[PDB]
Ligand binder design. Sequence first.
Ligand SMILES: Nc1ncnc2c1ncn2[C@@H]1O[C@H](CSCC[C@H](N)C(=O)O)[C@@H](O)[C@H]1O
Length: 544
Amino acid sequence: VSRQKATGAHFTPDKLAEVIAKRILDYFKGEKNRVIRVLDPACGDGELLLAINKVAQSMNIQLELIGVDFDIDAINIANERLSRSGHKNFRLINKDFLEMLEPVDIIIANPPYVRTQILGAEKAQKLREKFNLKGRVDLYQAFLVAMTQQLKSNGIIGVITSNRYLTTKGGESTRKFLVSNFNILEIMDLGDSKFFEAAVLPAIFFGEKKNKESNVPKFFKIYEQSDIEASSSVNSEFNSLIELLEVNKSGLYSVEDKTYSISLGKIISPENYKEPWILATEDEYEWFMKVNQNAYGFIEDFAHVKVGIKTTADSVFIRSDWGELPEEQIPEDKLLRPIISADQANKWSVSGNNKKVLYTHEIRDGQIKAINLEEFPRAKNYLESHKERLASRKYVLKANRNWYEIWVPHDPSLWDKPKIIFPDTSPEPKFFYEDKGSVVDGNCYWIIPKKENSNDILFLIMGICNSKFMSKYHDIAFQNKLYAGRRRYLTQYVNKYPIPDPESIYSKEIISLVRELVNNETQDINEIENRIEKLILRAFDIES
DNA sequence: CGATCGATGC
DNA sequence: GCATCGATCG
Ligand SMILES: Nc1ncnc2c1ncn2[C@@H]1O[C@H](CSCC[C@H](N)C(=O)O)[C@@H](O)[C@H]1O
């Protein structure tokens, strides 16, 4: 990994910095008669301190600028830019802000984002114990805790981070810490606007630190809108993307080359931090709540939403060229199982393609055990070739498991059951039925019924999951998006899909219609699809 | 065990 | 400009 990657050295663009500065000073309710202390805990080359001082000078406000950064080169360049700007009252400290100073009145920040795997398992454990965090902790989550305690009560914070704390399971500690330490003023999900050169969807958090001794938090949400429906008008009286960040009306806006969907509203009861924070309008949230009330249950109550095998060496275990190998290394046909990947995914039906996985696990004496390499000589010599890469996986040997094993093989006896398969990263739901007993690749998830009767129940789930109804429910309840409108069909989200009463007459016709799309079509598939949409609306007792 | 997360990664 | 895939947490 690069130095910039491990240190999160990604500067804030000057125009985005100005946006953050203006909101901070408009939200600030301090005295402003004396020197206001401003802190940037990871100041980089000083862009945020310059941006907030520029805005404050236009208000005849005097600031004390304080910036910290553990990189001396960043400190050196920030001192040069601040000194040349003509501002005298500033101070820079070269240190680890986390420390592995008097409290300030304002914090403007864009802390580094470093994922758990780049921090290493050892340092991630220290951050969790020091700042009371859980899960796959990111470096920006630690900085959120560390910088918050440097802020005086009633002080204003304005910090941009990755938006993923809003919607991920691992963001739970951050959401809890934020709502219990701040009077949340505004959360701006910048979505896929791509203000940074880096591939990241950021969010900006504005809040007033609680006093411990009378406010409704609002939100701003902007994402690129790819599909403009016929009856939707677009506003184009804004020339720059940075200008859309001060729009105060929901709707479609186009900084030409792109059209953006902007939503404003209130965040609903963020104190329920264990669920993802939902940024939805009043109408979207009402429709979302009415579905939940009229829901019979959820997929979690009916089926196991499981991820495919996690091999941790895909190029070694998953191939299609098994036949054109040395005859001494062609694995025994018992070990080559057909495996379905995300590039074969479609709706209801799959598109054999010679793609097989070398399955290293089996059922011996009623238990799941790894295979014996002495029993499969041709498969042994093949895995002997890549032993260096396979044995270098430290986590494999720490669990007292063999170097040649698939890391997560799941249960070899469960592949035979009929199942629903769908891809994780996808802009549209592609849930299809499969009863041929093939393995599921790690880029896909798969659904088997909790009840030992796959009849009807998987077909009802499949019709729900593929529907535009559930895509609308997903975009409201589970707002985790990659670039290009790609949803994340993960266990933690699909478990929470609502399901109507499977004994309802509307549900029974969905099952028969879905059974036609699986068992048996020309372009009349959409005729049945639209019929399922109306049946789903009747099953949930709504009409949108 | 088994699902997560990605200043994505080319 | 489009769909990771392997270290990680619990
Ligand atoms: N442990 C640590 N303590 C202090 N600064 C750190 C740090 N780890 C990374 N940083 C710094 O955090 C910065 C993040 S880049 C953001 C820079 C600036 N605030 C801006 O928004 O433009 C980098 O300059 C990096 O050197």
